[PDB]
Design a protein around this ligand. Structure first.
Ligand code: ACO
Length: 196
């Protein structure tokens, strides 16, 4: 990824080595680890994953910045550690269909929760996938007790498609209908790109 994406309240920037120390600190929250799909890493592994995640052709990943905390402009590829808030990604992980993508979202900083940053970050990333990856269905895998994430995805219009009692995990789907495709592309048309 060579660009960052500026919406109304968030900037989605490429995950950089400069972001790793704060990201690693977020991941010390066992609740965050369990709520996301994450295993605890060493710092070494966290740095190596920054390189591998961002080189993976089947993934798109961004660090979420809260625009209220950004100091300086978005035009020079700077990491803006001071505004780091979370992450968002899509993974094309369906062997049967390269136009299906799984979504993940995390807003790790309490000071930035409840401002609509998770919703906007997911919508921008979904729209990016529709335009550039031709995604026609998104999925989300959510722990059965994760009230906050279940609410977010359902309020976006994701619908439950299956449940694993073994893993205590709900899977939701978002078919990209003609109307949703139009809406998402219009939204992305208003997102400012910066070279990064
Ligand atoms: C598919 C996956 O990624 S599963 C893993 C999801 N990530 C996590 O669980 C990490 C821990 N939690 C988080 O990161 C955050 O709580 C998130 C991402 C779930 C929500 O981030 P926020 O930025 O606070 O959400 P945002 O402010 O954009 O609100 C969006 C919707 O989320 C829902 N929501 C957010 N927080 C809560 C909550 N505490 N309880 C219930 N619903 C909630 C609401 O429906 C809200 O819509 P409303 O504002 O109209 O009520």
């Amino acid at each position: 990824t060579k660009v960052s994406l500026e919406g109304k309240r968030v900037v989605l920037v490429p995950y950089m080595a400069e972001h790793v120390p704060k990201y690693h600190q977020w991941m010390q929250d066992s609740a965050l680890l369990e709520a996301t799909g994450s295993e605890p890493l060493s710092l070494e592994q966290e740095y190596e994953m920054q390189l591998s995640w961002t080189q993976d052709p089947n993934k798109r990943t961004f660090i979420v910045l809260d625009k209220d905390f950004v100091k300086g402009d978005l035009a020079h590829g700077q990491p803006h550690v001071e505004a780091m808030t979370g992450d968002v990604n899509i993974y094309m992980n369906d062997v049967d269909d390269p136009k299906v993508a799984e979504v993940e979202i995390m807003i790790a900083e309490p000071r930035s929760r409840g401002k609509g940053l998770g919703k906007e970050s997911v919508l921008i990333m979904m729209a990016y996938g529709v335009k550039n990856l031709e995604i026609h269905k998104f999925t989300a895998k959510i722990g059965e007790s994760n009230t906050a994430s279940l609410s977010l995805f359902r309020k976006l219009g994701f619908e439950e498609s299956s449940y694993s009692g073994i893993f205590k995990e709900v899977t939701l789907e978002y078919p990209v209908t003609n109307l949703r495709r139009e809406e998402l592309l219009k939204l992305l048309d208003e997102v400012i790109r910066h070279t990064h």
